RNA sequence: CUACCCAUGUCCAGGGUGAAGUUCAGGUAACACUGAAUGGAGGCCCGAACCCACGCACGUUGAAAAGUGCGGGGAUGAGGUGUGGGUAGGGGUGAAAUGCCAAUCGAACCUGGAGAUAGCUGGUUCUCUCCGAAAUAGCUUUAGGGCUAGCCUCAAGGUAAGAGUCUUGGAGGUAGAGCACUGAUUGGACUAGGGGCCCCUACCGGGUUACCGAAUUCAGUCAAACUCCGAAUGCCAAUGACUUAUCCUUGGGAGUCAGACUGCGAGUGAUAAGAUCCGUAGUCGAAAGGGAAACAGCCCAGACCGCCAGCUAAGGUCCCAAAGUAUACGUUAAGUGGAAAAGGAUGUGGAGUUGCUUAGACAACCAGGAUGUUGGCUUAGAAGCAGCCACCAUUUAAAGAGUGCG
RNA sequence: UAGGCCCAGGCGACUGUUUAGCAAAAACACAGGUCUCUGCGAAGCCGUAAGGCGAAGUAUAGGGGCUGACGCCUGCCCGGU
RNA sequence: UCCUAAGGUAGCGAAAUUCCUUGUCGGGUAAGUUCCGACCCGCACGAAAGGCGCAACGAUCUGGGCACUGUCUCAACGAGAGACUCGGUGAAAUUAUAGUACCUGUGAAGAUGCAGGUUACCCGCGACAGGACGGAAAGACCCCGUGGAGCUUUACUGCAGCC
RNA sequence: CUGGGGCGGUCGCCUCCUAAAAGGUAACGGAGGCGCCCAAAGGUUCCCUCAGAAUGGUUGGAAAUCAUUCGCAGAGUGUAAA
RNA sequence: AAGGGCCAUCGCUCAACGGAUAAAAGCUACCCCGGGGAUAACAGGCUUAUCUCCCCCAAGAGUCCACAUCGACGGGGAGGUUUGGCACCUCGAUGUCGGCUCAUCGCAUCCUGGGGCUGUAGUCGGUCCCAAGGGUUGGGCUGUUCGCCCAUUAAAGCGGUA
RNA sequence: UGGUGGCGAUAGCGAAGAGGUCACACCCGUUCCCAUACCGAACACGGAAGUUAAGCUCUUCAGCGCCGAUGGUAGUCGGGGGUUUCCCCCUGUGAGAGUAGGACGCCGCCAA
RNA sequence: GGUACCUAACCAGAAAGCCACGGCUAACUACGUGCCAGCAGCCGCGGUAAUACGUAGGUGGCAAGCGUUGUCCGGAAUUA
RNA sequence: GGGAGUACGGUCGCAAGACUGAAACUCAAAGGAAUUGACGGGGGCCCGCACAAGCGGUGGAGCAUGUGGUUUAAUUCGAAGCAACGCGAAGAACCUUACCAGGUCUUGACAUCCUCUGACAAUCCUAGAGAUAGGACGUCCCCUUCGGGGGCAGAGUGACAGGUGGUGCAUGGUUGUCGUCAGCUCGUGUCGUGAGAUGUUGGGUUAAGUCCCGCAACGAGCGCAACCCUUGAUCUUAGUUG
RNA sequence: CUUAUGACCUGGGCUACACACGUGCUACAAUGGACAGAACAAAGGGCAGCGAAACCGCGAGGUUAAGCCAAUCCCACAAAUCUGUUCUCAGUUCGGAUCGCAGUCUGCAACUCGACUGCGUGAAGCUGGAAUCGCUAGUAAUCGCGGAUCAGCAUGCCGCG
RNA sequence: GCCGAGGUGGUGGAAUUGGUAGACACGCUACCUUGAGGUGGUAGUGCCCAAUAGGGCUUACGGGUUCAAGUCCCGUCCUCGGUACCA
RNA sequence: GCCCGGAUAGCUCAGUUGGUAGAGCAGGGGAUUGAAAAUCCCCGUGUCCUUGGUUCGAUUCCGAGUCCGGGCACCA
RNA sequence: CCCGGAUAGCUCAGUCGGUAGAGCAGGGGAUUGAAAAUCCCCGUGUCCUUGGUUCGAUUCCGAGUCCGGGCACCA
């Protein structure tokens, strides 16, 4: 039955259209104020340290490095080394 | 007798209860009305005779083929009975039960067809000799019955044709075994492909994992309806040999068609039955004797008949109860043997392996019971000790931050 | 030697009758209700005719079925029979 | 919303119907599977197979209370009629022969009789009935017979009778 | 018929397994058929492979059709089974 | 000539399929009669699926602590009362449940006696072990057995024995 | 060498080569007989440029396939026995599997 | 009971409150408050400017008392 | 007034129910006639593109545009039947602009005060996205009988300033709307205890309370129309850039 | 309310879009399409404002620039119309969105987010369901033009024939 | 327990014949109508992707047979109608 | 006198021998109104009774009061 | 063995030789502040197939399916 309270938390991602209460708690190489992303590859937790790849657009994903997705990139110079702050 | 019914006489002790009326008085215009007295109706009440059977008790080879005892319900009407008649069995009759119709009734009674029929049950008498079975198959409104075939006897034949063993020759696909087909199924390597963390992002560009994974091959099992394989036997053979005589044909006559149990080969079941359905083999049935204490069905063995003789089998040999307290070598100590398991067990017997093992073990006695660091957390502490985490290392003959314990 | 009484309850209204000789009632009967047959040689019955029951009767009568005094009541379905 | 020719109205309701059940809720009792009062998830009540309620009635039938009681705890005693005893008369069902012990064990599976043991002098009499599968009735239930008789209707062929 | 009958299920045929390496053998024991169909699905004559897989490829896709190898067999055998 | 045989021949789920007839279904508790333990219920018998009684392995619960007490998924048995299988004796009769009457027998024990461990302070207790000599209440309901209930008692035992 | 038989693939595939003057083959063409559901692919018809590559034969080898012992074992006809869903002992029989091995051809007939 | 009383001496020293304040009904403003908290005998007041709630100021009422309460009569000619 | 002709108790009846007949409770009112109104699937008269008789479109199609919703950091706020929805916007690239993020700033961007001190500026420089800075140079205030005044600037100071913060159910003002519909009242007189009624209704007409007649009413006022413009004819005067 | 609900700057947004709604134009064609010729208005606007002619660009326009503070000059050559030519009934020689490339203007700056050409591309749609809306004579419909508003931008709204 | 029937869009219910539908009605869905309702009027409306075309998925569940299966065949599960008898 | 537990949002109630805290309702947030109801949703919104206390966080563990809830004692 | 039903989408009629007829439905029309129910219009038919008589002939004989009512054979 708390299985099924899981089940009905499914709206606990509807605070995150619309903002969310955010610092600028990703520190991009010592400058502030950046659009940055958590990587959905893995999480970026404080166990090895964590890259900001530069992308295409639509945001800077912070890859978490360690990972088979940021460590098979083309094009190296997109990946910049960040703060967690 | 009884069931109603038809004409006909007949009986019912007493007491209670009191309507319809009636009359009088009152009352009203007058009938309604009211009160007295009278009158006495009632499938009315209580209770005898008299009917009637409810409730127990007694009876039950009873006093009695339905009673008596102590009490009970109707007892002036749908009543009770006496006498004289009526209705007849596939009918009568019935305030109805299928009750009564002569101690009879889901069709009375009596002689008749009639010695009915009965595939059912009981019974079937004098003796020996001669050989002698079966309980299954098919079909059947049959399934406990029957006929044909199977197996037995009697007669006559053709005659050695039969059976057993050895011999060579096959047909056949279980038990076993195998996994090559069929299915089932273990595990690893490998992987098309598939999503998924998801990245870059037109479900489009590709990376990724133990997130799966078809195929793939490597080893691995498994079968009543899996066979590349495949025995023993059992069966049809030819062929001679040996030892035996029994087969077939024709004909008279049958009985048997409910079977049991022990072992191996299966099914049904619960790998339950002294269960059931069969296979092939026994015994019993139809077979007495001896053992299994006694006991159809197991283990021996077939009984013409007599003896106050002899030998063996199964099983027995201290005593019932005939036979060795024989003989050799071991083994149990439980009365196991004379009841049964998973499993538990310093019970013991005989093996084998190998560590320890007089520069001396085992038990026990005496001392050693460390260092880094009395370790530090979660916590108010842990010298491991609420419990981790480095399975660390030198002091030393030797001590693990540890067997434990609290 | 001649009532034991009181409280309720269904089932039968009631007195009556049967299971001679297991079973007396909650069954039958019953008054009343009721639908229907039947115009008189009625219908129904006995049973192949007669004959004289029904009835020396005549729809306010007589057979038959269904229920059961009285009081309150008896609604729906004509497709099948 | 499908289906009917039509979908149970009045009054009753765990009922002489009710399975689950002793339904639940209340009075009766210290305690109440029955009984009464109400409840309706009426398995399967229902209107002349009649529905409900009914004062009077019954050797009906369930339940409760008083009265009084050997019905009972818990038996006792007394009368008499059988019983036993002494003369009189004197049957019957049944009955293989019968000097008939009881434990196990076996067996047509539950012994008086056989085997193993155990105990027991012979013979009556008064009582009890555990047993002889004690007697009386070739089982009333149950299944077969190609039995049988009553009953039944849209089984079959028939017949009477009215058409 | 019947592991007492009742109801329920079945009744003859064909194939398999039980069946015990010949044939046969039962159970209300295990598995499925049949009351046909065909005028070519027979008769002969002559002819020639199949099932998938793997590729290569419009529409085409896992799976139409074309080749193309590798394929004694996995298919096809009017229809159940051996 | 009729009609008959011969031959070819068609009409039947006559399916219960070797087809008794061209043509067929019901109840008996109102019951008979011949038969059967060939064939049931009641009991006996064999077996033990089911049924209570034990145990085995131990994950775990029990603060820690498997083993005071419980003990899952699982295994193995013993008992022959129950629900049942089989149809062996009994259908020329073995009367069957429940109470009353007289009790008898086993022990897996309910009290009483003895003890061991305990999560046994003490008083009660839980649990196995030795014990069958003695006892085991009285009622309301139910036909009751069981069980609920009231009230006690030291205890309100279970199971045979047709 | 060719044609054609018989012998359980011990005759198989598989790979490695060799050979062709004739022989046998591919190979060259459809005018004709005949033809492919469409065709000279095959079947028919006829021809001989070059071709040993294919097949055809001739050799080597054991990689698969195949054959196949001995030894023992399973199971087992009968003989008895024991704790009786099974099992032991004796006489006799005797596989499969697994190998040792054999084998990548033998025997005929006719033409040259 | 030396009590009433009277005589003299003493001090602004000892000593006021509750009720009302929209209309009935004499007397009102300011804050708080926002169908909530609360008033209410009658009509009825408050969903953001409450003279009606609560508070403060200020009035008014009456006084050692004032309000509320339950009674009985009256107004009630509304038992005539 | 409801509770109610109900319950209970009793009589009466064959029953259905009649007759006698409450109470606890609860609202401050339920009803009586009358008046002005509004409505009527009530009547009579009568009007407008309302309907009929026609024309042309909207609803399908793309696209512009407007609000919905939804969407985001925010999608600024208001308007919501006709009488909001090409509307405030007679013009959203920044400005507008409020909204959202970042950068800021705090007598203020803007107004009076008050205290001074002098013109501030202008520019280029580096910043920086820019606001804002820091600077450089350049700071030149006028009018006076010399004190002052007029600004302008900055520094201050507390006053205050500021709000496109909220309520259009506090409001002025401003317009839509019924509709350019034919209506709304007053003065005097009476009428009726009073509310109100007459005038305005009755008759005849009109686009109309237009107007006439009648009339216990006579009158007046706001409305209608008119005078105001435009267009439609002509004359006078005036003719250029006509 | 106040070192913020006030002020300033950058940049974003008011323009989002799975989907309905009003409100507007351009169309679904032969009374049309295409090309050429011919002719015809009213009203308004113009000083950092209009810009002629002229030349150059395929063109939107560029270039220079007369004239005009205006019945003088410019915006402005009106369109429908008329007459020829061609088109022949189909998703086309109608449609013109959507979209690519190449351009021009204004302005600091046209990416979100402007207008207009030049080239290409060429869908939806072949008179639209129930229901509804306007209109009594220069109105209905139809065709262009002017202006406010604005640097820039109209299928919008006024106003004009 | 045994038989007999039947398992469905949001819901109720036909398609029970061999070839594909998931009728038809009622929901529900946007619009039209009304001042907003209910009502009435068109349009779709099984689930899920593609605003389109199309595809997947399926008629309790599970498996077979088929070129096929809501149906054919069989196992499980659910719910109804009928039976559970004689001593 | 004695001892034994609870002293938790606004209200109910979960955290319990140690993870600071939930849940329900109420209430508030705005859309829309005079504000309500209706419709659209959002939000916990706590001296864990205080005083202390071993501290490397305690609502719980401990004492100390206070307080609530108890049952035993104390007969003048 | 006889008798009953073979057309328009459907339900149904219907000539003695010369041909397409109703109703319901389909399609639209007007009607109506909407709605059915009415009110009109065309629609669509080898009159079952095959031969024959005959000038061709649903017409009408020569030749047959399938549904209902019965007499009555059925070993």
């Keep these: 039955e708390q299985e099924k309270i899981v089940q009905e938390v499914t709206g606990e991602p ?5 903002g969310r209460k955010r610092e600028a708690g990703v520190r991009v190489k010592g400058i502030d104020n950046l659009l940055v992303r958590l ?4 999480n970026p937790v ?7 790849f530069i992308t295409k657009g639509r945001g ?7 990972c088979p997705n ?3 990139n083309e094009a ?3 990946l910049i080394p960040v703060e967690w702050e």
Excluded at 14 to 18: L, T, V
Excluded at 39 to 42: E, G, L, R
Excluded at 46 to 52: A, L
């Design 46 to 52: 404080p166990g090895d340290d964590i890259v900001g």
């Design 76 to 78: 190296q110079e997109r």
């Design 39 to 42: 990587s959905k590859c893995c």
């Design 70 to 72: 940021v460590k098979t």
């Design 14 to 18: 509807k605070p995150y259209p619309q």
């Design 60 to 66: 800077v994903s912070v890859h978490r490095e360690d």
